Amino acid sequence: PQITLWQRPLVTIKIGGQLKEALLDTGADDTVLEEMSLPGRWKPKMIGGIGGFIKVRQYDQIPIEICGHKAIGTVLVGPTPTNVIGRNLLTQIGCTLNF
Amino acid sequence: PQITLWQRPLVTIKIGGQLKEALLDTGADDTVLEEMSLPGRWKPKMIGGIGGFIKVRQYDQIPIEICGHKAIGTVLVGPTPTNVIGRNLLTQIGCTLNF
Numbered sequence: 001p002q003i004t005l006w007q008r009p010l011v012t013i014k015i016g017g018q019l020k021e022a023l024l025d026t027g028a029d030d031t032v033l034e035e036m037s038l039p040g041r042w043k044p045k046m047i048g049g050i051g052g053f054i055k056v057r058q059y060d061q062i063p064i065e066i067c068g069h070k071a072i073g074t075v076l077v078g079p080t081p082t083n084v085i086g087r088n089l090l091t092q093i094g095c096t097l098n099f
Numbered sequence: 100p101q102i103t104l105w106q107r108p109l110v111t112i113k114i115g116g117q118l119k120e121a122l123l124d125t126g127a128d129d130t131v132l133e134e135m136s137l138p139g140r141w142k143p144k145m146i147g148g149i150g151g152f153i154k155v156r157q158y159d160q161i162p163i164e165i166c167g168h169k170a171i172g173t174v175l176v177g178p179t180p181t182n183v184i185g186r187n188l189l190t191q192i193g194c195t196l197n198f
């Protein structure tokens with residue numbers, strides 16, 4: 001698709017068999033979702049934004065569908081204000097910026 | 100242009116007679132720049148991201164040039180850790196996401 005930016009670029013994702021809404025976010029290196037359950041072991045990560053840092057749980061090699069496009073990669077879980085799909089997965093689904 | 104997302108999408112902007120580097124950020128509603136002087140009226144605002152809120156000064160109707168593209172819009176100025184170009188200006192240069 002081609003997605004304009006007059007509204008937030010919110011898309012439906014599927015992870016762990018559940019649908020969620022998430023923001024396609026070229027300003028995010030990584031993908032960070034609100035608290036949820038994922039399988040396996042996790043590692044610690046600190047990620048910084050406008051208001052400072054939060055601590056998240058890092059899960060690797062997680063299947064996730066983004067607008068129906070299949071990806072498998074790193075998902076961070078923690079107290080983010082909104083679900084954000086960052087460049088780690090935007091590159092998997094072949095997303096670019098164009099103008 | 101078509102901008103890859105393998106790396107952070109950084110551009111040069113011209114604003115208030117200054118050249119600055121900033122991130123093309125589809126997850127940002129608003130353009131937010133580090134401390135700088137701008138002419139005209141402003142009002143205080145709180146904006147929130149990962150890690151919570153910062154106080155900024157909101158300037159309206161500010162001319163800005165991004166990749167040779169002229170646009171005008173609102174610029175928030177305050178203690179952001181990095182300069183971001185938000186949707187309010189990305190629309191004006193015809194920037195879309197594509198995959």
Ligand SMILES: C/N=c1/[nH]c2ccc(S(=O)(=O)N(CC(C)C)C[C@@H](O)[C@H](Cc3ccccc3)NC(=O)O[C@H]3CO[C@H]4OC[C@H](OCC(=O)NC)[C@H]43)cc2o1
Nearest residue numbers: 027028029030047048049050081126127128129147148149
């Ligand atoms: C190392 N790896 C990682 N991975 C990783 C992943 C993400 C982040 S990130 O999130 O810090 N961030 C980095 C950029 C911003 C430098 C991404 C950026 O696009 C955020 C995303 C976001 C959108 C909405 C809320 C919070 C954050 N946008 C944002 O700040 O927007 C602000 C300015 O404009 C408004 O619009 C929205 C928000 O108000 C709405 C609200 O609800 N506020 C509370 C306001 C850092 C990361 O580092």
Ligand SMILES: [Cl-]
Nearest residue numbers: 073074088089
């Ligand atoms: Cl990844």
Ligand SMILES: [Cl-]
Nearest residue numbers: 171172173187
């Ligand atoms: Cl504006």
Ligand SMILES: [Cl-]
Nearest residue numbers: 004005190193
């Ligand atoms: Cl348009």
